């Protein structure tokens, strides 16, 4: 399970 705060954009 990676970081949920990772870049959520394209």
């Amino acid at each position, epitope marked *: 399970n990676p970081d*949920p705060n990772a*870049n959520p*954009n394209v």
Partner: antibody
């Protein structure tokens, strides 16, 4: 210009379901990650859920984990939040929030907020 | 992370220099955001990355700090600045948490 408009709020019986909507305009909806952040004057703001731009990764707060279902429609540029088993503490002004367009591995702040929709959970 | 903002409410006047202190229970590096919310209105982003100004925000708003201690500074207060300011963390697996907010009101 860029704006967000919420809809679908109202008074809901406890334990029932209520789905909130968010209409997007001006910006490319499919290229942004969205959020739901509610707020009550007694406790301040509270993050609810986030959905990825492609809808891959979805996360929820512990207080709403398993009861809320976040989803988006890149075709119609709409962000929706299915709320199930609504308790009285769910009563808050729900905002659909857009993250700031960041380049890198990490997300950004909240650069876009809607006017907010009011839901009142009471029997 | 638990964001604690002190004081809960602060009185000020027009032209004063306002420094609002935001504390995080854990260390969030510089992934902190500042907001301004008028009563009945949507929150308005002011500063992201705890030191970077947002487009459209006047230069009087400045932010600094890293780790656990952060500060929002207003060089000269303005009549349209009386609102409630929130600080929020978005670092690492710690998802997204706001403080209780600091309300800046007019004296007397």
């Amino acid at each position: 210009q860029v704006q967000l408009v919420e809809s679908g709020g109202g008074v809901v019986q406890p334990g029932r379901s209520l789905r909130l909507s968010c209409a997007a305009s001006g910006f490319a909806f499919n290229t942004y990650g969205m959020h739901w952040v509610r707020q009550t004057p007694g406790k301040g703001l509270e993050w609810v859920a986030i959905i990825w731009y492609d809808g891959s990764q979805k996360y929820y707060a512990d207080s709403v984990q398993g009861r809320f279902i976040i989803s988006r429609d890149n075709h119609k540029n709409t962000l929706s939040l299915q709320m199930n088993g609504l308790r009285a503490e769910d009563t808050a002004v729900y905002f659909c929030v857009r993250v700031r367009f960041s380049v890198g591995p990490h997300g950004s702040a909240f650069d876009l907020w809607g006017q907010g929709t009011m839901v009142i959970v009471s029997s | 992370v638990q964001m604690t903002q002190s004081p809960s409410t602060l009185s000020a006047s027009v032209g004063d220099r306002v420094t609002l202190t935001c504390r995080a229970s854990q260390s969030i590096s510089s992934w902190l955001a500042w907001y301004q919310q008028k009563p009945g209105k949507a929150p308005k982003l002011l500063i992201y990355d705890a030191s970077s100004l947002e487009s459209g925000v006047p230069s009087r708003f400045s932010g600094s700090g890293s780790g656990t201690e952060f500060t929002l500074t207003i060089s000269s207060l303005q009549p349209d600045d009386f609102a409630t300011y929130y600080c929020q963390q978005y670092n690492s697996y710690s998802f997204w948490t706001f403080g209780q907010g600091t309300k800046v009101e007019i004296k007397r």
